[PDB]
Symmetry: C2
Subunit: 517 residues, 2 copies
């Protein structure tokens, strides 16, 4: 049920439409040409020795044309004052009974321009303003309006400027009301767009080529996640939405492209929380002839570059929403490097290699809240990965690279070049307690790759709930063609944006996050 259709404001505003048309005025006209942005006007004349209001009345000061939403209005008799919001910038306007005209309002109309402005316009209407600049004596840049043009008649009132909890929840769907009302929300989303641009700048300077690969595939992989499934009618075929970019980009390495990246939507059909939306944006990037130590430098340099460009060359950022209180994190490279084992000793208090497997499980029972089913029959590598999750991850506030993970954690990474085949040359980057990056010395031994994908699914099929996952033969054939040694990474871009915009929730960095009905 659409409630506003019976609201008093909607009925009152719509009844003005016929009145305005009867005056010969189109309430939804076609353009407003030669229209400067309020912010460009500010930048052009704020540092400038403009006249006072009487100079504007004398038409001696600069004449400007601009447009925006009427967000404040006060009638003062012969004069009226208002505020126009244009694309995150505001400017004061002044209407005068003698000076101001309404476009399309005939001289022999039954209503004066100033009365039209008071009675037929409303807060929320979009207006085109042409007039003369001046400074109030308080220094407020103001426009004496010579001609006002109605550009859009709004039919509901402005949103409440200061949302309580319930209004905020609705504005995650009705995002336009958030963008109208909140300077902070507007700035968050402008910064997000700048971050995406800075990423492309950095990768391009490093000679990576940006590509696109399919979201809809007959397979899925390159991560551990439940997929979305859909039906292609033309071929009467089930398709998956990709859970990662990895396999497709690796095929491009085989194809001879030495440095590729993609910034794209990936889809994981799982739970929704402060750091998880089912549709999210990743960059994956791959450079032939690199290993994971090369990738580590690329990832920290990328993030430092973004932060410096946003914060006047500074590398420190304030984040306010951790349960432990406000933090300052420094993204200056190099970030801290630790092995997973080292991080469990330093932050967890457990030297993993001094304990047998049986002793590790007792620590998990006593020092964590993991259910017995999680660790009762897990392997040594799986137990180490669990100790990290529970005793370490939350403590990684400053930027950390965590290196050398158990082989169990992934089938797509080479093992340690030293010969230790129980650990892989993987790292995950953490900041503010949350995972930010995943990177490998990429596996390109086709026989070893097949064996790990075979051993993975035999283990994955041990759980009766994991959807069966057939081996991606096309990928193995591409590796037989020959993939160069390579180093690759994947960064959750929404999470990066949260850290850099002081966003408490991923819902704050997506225009339209997934919401309950």
């Amino acid at each position: 049920e659409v409630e506003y259709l019976q609201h008093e404001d909607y009925l009152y505003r719509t009844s003005k439409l016929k009145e305005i048309r009867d005056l010969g005025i189109n309430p939804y006209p076609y353009q407003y040409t030669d229209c400067l942005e309020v912010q460009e006007i500010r930048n052009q004349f704020v540092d400038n020795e403009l006249g006072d209001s009487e100079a504007a009345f004398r038409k001696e000061t600069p004449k400007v044309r601009f447009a925006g939403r009427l967000v404040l209005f006060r009638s003062m008799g012969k004069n009226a004052f208002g505020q126009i919001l244009d694309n995150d910038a505001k400017i004061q306007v002044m209407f005068n009974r003698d000076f101001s005209a309404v476009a399309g309002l005939a001289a022999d109309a039954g209503i004066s321009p100033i009365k039209f402005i008071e009675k037929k316009l409303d807060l929320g209407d979009i207006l085109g303003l042409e007039g003369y600049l001046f400074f109030t004596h308080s220094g407020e840049l103001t426009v004496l309006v010579e001609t006002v043009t109605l550009l859009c008649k709004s039919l509901i009132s402005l949103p409440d400027k200061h949302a309580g909890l319930a209004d905020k929840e609705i504005r995650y769907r009705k995002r336009w009301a958030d963008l109208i009302s909140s300077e902070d929300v507007r700035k968050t989303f402008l910064t997000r767009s700048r971050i995406l641009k800075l990423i492309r700048e950095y990768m391009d300077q490093q000679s990576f080529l940006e590509v696109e690969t399919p979201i809809l595939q007959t397979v899925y992989g390159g991560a551990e996640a439940t997929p979305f499934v859909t039906t292609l009618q033309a071929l009467h075929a089930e398709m998956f939405l990709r859970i990662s970019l990895e396999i497709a980009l690796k095929k491009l390495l085989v194809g001879g492209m030495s440095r590729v990246y993609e910034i794209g939507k990936v889809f994981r059909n799982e739970g929704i929380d402060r750091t998880h939306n089912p549709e999210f944006t990743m960059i994956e990037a791959y450079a032939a002839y690199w290993d994971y130590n090369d990738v580590m430098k690329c990832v920290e340099n990328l993030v430092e570059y973004i932060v410096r460009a946003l914060n006047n060359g500074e590398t420190q950022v304030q984040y306010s929403h951790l349960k432990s209180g406000p933090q300052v994190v420094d993204f200056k490279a190099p970030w801290i490097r630790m092995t997973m084992k080292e991080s469990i000793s330093v932050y967890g208090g457990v030297d993993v290699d001094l304990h047998a497997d049986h002793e590790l499980r007792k620590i998990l029972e006593t020092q964590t809240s993991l259910p017995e089913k999680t660790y009762v029959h897990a392997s040594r590598g799986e137990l180490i990965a669990l100790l990290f999750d529970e005793l370490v991850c939350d403590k990684l506030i400053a930027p950390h690279h965590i290196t050398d993970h158990p082989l169990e954690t992934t089938p797509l990474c080479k093992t340690l070049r030293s010969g230790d085949e129980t650990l892989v040359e993987r790292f995950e980057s953490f900041c503010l307690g949350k995972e930010l990056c995943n990177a490998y010395s990429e596996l390109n031994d086709p026989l070893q790759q097949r064996k790990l994908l075979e051993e993975q699914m035999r283990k994955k099929a041990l759980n009766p709930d994991s959807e069966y996952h057939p081996i991606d033969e096309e990928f193995l054939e591409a590796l037989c063609q020959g993939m160069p040694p390579a180093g690759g990474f994947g960064i959750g871009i929404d999470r990066l944006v949260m850290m850099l915009t002081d966003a408490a929730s991923i819902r704050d960095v997506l225009f339209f996050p997934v919401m309950r009905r």
Copy 2:
């Protein structure tokens, strides 16, 4: 059934893995440090003074490191010559019995470096090369190799050069093989990446902000297309993949963002042909206070800019694949502009407003192959659009903007400012007989918007093949909040890429196009 695992060449290549490893050489090593690109090497010394082969043997010429795939090889006794392919650039290599060492091959090994190169390496292997540059007597850039490093032992041969129908059809799946064997394929996809980068540069310069909006939504709209459907588990909810970008971006204009664009995947669950893939890339862009004439200029200027950047300032492009023979088209702005009615006269030979509806029907009956069901009861506006489809569209070879479409073709556009409410301020741009762009003076009268969507719903209720499609109430509520007058366009980027890379099919501009099983 994987055929190559039973092929002789797979046995031959895999059998060398043990032999190479028994010599202490890792066939899949971890990196190749400080590796220059062959293109960068060519840029630096091709147009430069360089020594001859004897200078290289004296180690007086520039020393370089690079890597790539061995794609030609010929032994001449003590010398051997080959070609290395690195990301669409090639360089010749020379090996010599006394000068060239193999990384990790011991002196007391049982095989000589030259014999290892001849016998343990194969075409298709990925090699790291360190050596000295020189020019052959014929002037070809060559590297006398001081050390070769095996970076990847390929287990299958280079792709066959003899393409057929069966061969090239598999290449659309096994794209890595296509990329290795075909310079034209590599250049097509390199050009595609440049086009995307050029679009972003142009749009950014016009002050459009790049945004992302969601692919997965609870509604679909903004085009006439069958959607893909999927299921979001966490909410037990049916979702649609978007069929266009339009509604989400319009909501951002309501929110106060003056100029936005998105380059994103959209999904239309329909048929496959030379200009349709179910997943394709669109740019949509919206500018407040513009109309369709402003957009027309923006579109043709955007495309002219792209063409000039790719073609050293020229605006003419050759396209080879039309049934009418090769064409030259000129993307120079301004493009030809005609109304739909004018184009039916100029190209179709019909002057529509001299004819009654029943004469239009009789023209469709006798001059086209449309089934009678399509026109026997169609409205005048629908008859005009069918006359354009059948008698005009294929003849629009040079770039055209076709303006002022019947109202029936879309519910999202303003009618003509002249007061002719049977036509809308829409244009579609055509080149080489195909639609390139769709653009509007955007409809922002909420009452008129609801009326047109209701009329569409009433019409679709009569077609038993289409399921009920509820009106988007959130979109209508945003329009009530108030959208500025605006102009928007959507361009099919894959079709633009086809036109600028002389691609016969959309399958030639997607790395992994949708393929029958």
